[PDB]
Amino acid sequence: TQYIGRFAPSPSGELHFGSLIAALGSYLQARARQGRWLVRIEDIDPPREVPGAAETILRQLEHYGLHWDGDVLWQSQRHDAYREALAWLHEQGLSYYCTCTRARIQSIGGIYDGHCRVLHHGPDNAAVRIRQQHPVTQFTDQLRGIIHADEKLAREDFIIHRRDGLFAYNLAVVVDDHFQGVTEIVRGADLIEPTVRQISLYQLFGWKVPDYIHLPLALNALPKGDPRPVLIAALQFLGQQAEAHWQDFSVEQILQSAVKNWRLTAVPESAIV
Ligand SMILES: [Zn+2]
Numbered sequence: 001t002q003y004i005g006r007f008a009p010s011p012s013g014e015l016h017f018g019s020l021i022a023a024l025g026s027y028l029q030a031r032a033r034q035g036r037w038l039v040r041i042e043d044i045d046p047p048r049e050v051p052g053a054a055e056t057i058l059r060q061l062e063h064y065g066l067h068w069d070g071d072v073l074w075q076s077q078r079h080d081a082y083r084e085a086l087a088w089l090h091e092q093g094l095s096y097y098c099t100c101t102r103a104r105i106q107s108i109g110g111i112y113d114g115h116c117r118v119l120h121h122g123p124d125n126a127a128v129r130i131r132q133q134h135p136v137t138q139f140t141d142q143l144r145g146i147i148h149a150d151e152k153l154a155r156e157d158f159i160i161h162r163r164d165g166l167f168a169y170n171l172a173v174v175v176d177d178h179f180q181g182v183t184e185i186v187r188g189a190d191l192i193e194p195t196v197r198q199i200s201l202y203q204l205f206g207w208k209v210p211d212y213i214h215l216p217l218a219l220n221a222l223p224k225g226d227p228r229p230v231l232i233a234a235l236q237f238l239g240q241q242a243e244a245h246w247q248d249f250s251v252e253q254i255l256q257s258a259v260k261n262w263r264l265t266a267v268p269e270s271a272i273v
Contacts, residue, residue, distance in 0.1 A: 003035025004181045007061075007068075008173070010042045011053035015060045017234070018188070018218040024234050025215045025267070026186035027066050027255075032262040038180055039068040044075040045166055064227045065251035073180060075172060082167045085175045085205075086128060086160065094204055095160065097126035114157050128161035133204065136196045142184075143213045144269050149196040158197055170194055174201045177210065184211040189271040213264070216273045227251055237273065239266035 007023045009015065015023070030037035039061065041054045058072065089095040098116040105112055117131060135155040138148050160171040177185065192214050202209045218237060223230055228246045231254055236242040241261050243254060 001183070003030060003033040004038065004183045005030035005033075005035060005186055006038040006040055006177070006180065006182055007066075008040040008042055008176075008187075009057050011049045011057060013050065014053055014056045014221045016221055017230070020064065020222060020230070020234050021215060021218050021237055022186075022188045023061060023064075023066055024231070025213075025238055028238075028240075028258055028262045029184070029186050029213065029264065031259040033184075035183075036069045038070060038073070038182070040073040040075065040176060040180065042075050042172075044078075044169075044172055046076055060222055064222070064231060065255045073176065075176065078172070078176060079167065081175055081179065082172055085171065089130070089160070089204070090128075094131050095128050096131055096157075097121040097123055098129050098159075099126050111152050112156050112158070117157065125163070127159050127163040129157040130160050130201065130204070132157055132200060134200075136199045136203070139195055139199055139212060141192075141212050141214055143215070143264060143267055147192060147195075149193055153193065154196045154200075156197075160201075170197050170201060174198050174205070174207075178202070178205070178207050182210055184213065186213040186215065189214045189217045192271070216268045216270050219272055228254065231255075237268075239263070239268055 005026050007026050009019060009023075027037050039058070041057070043049055043054055054074075061068070086095070096116055096119075098112075099121050100112070100115055104115075112129065116129070132155065136149075137151050137154040138146060141147055158168075158170065160168045162168060195212060195214075199209055215238070228249075228251060231251060232242050232246050235258055240258060240263065243249065243257070246254060
């Protein structure tokens with residue numbers, strides 16, 4: 001089956017150099033594998049995001065030559081799907097309602113103890129937690145090798161729907177990547193630790209687990225003007241050939257050659273650069 005990858009930005013700001021790295025690396029790996037590359041706007045909580053940011057992000061991708069396949073998926077148009085997934089989990093004996101306060105959880109060290117797991121509380125003024133069976137605590141990264149996660153965090157009956165009504169990231173990412181047919185997730189190293197919880201969720205749904213690559217995080221908005229020197233800097237960051245005389249080429253030519261020359265093994269394995 002065809003490779004399917006994606007870039008899934010949060011519209012809490014515009015793209016910066018760090019998010020360009022994630023977009024570019026996901027794009028290059030997808031195109032090198034003769035695959036599809038999709039874009040999903042994570043506008044799951046629009047009251048806490050910035051009007052106009054999603055549109056800015058899509059325009060920036062186009063400016064840097066990173067054109068996606070198909071239609072953009074919007075998480076603001078997917079709450080029906082998340083609700084459906086929650087209903088299935090509850091019906092299948094895989095979730096429960098938790099009425100514990102923030103203060104209680106804080107007092108026991110910040111990781112839930114499964115207090116409400118067999119209390120059979122109703123949905124009224126409650127969070128929804130997953131009822132883990134066999135938590136995943138390690139995974140394979142195609143760049144970094146085998147990763148060992150924080151065991152206490154990995155084994156928690158984690159929140160999948162918040163008491164304030166927000167759908168949890170870990171729920172929505174699995175439901176949407178599955179819906180879009182994603183076969184490999186190429187993203188930043190800041191998402192390493194939640195990976196094992198997401199894999200646990202794929203297993204509870206009975207769904208095929210994708211492959212994972214976590215790129216190094218670039219640490220301290222993209223220029224509106226000439227994108228070429230910024231693209232060259234991003235290619236260098238990712239350990240790729242970085243054309244000296246970029247002034248003689250278009251963005252499109254630079255990307256076409258970067259796809260031809262893409263070497264995953266040359267990407268740095270540091271968590272942060
Ligand atoms: Zn509870």
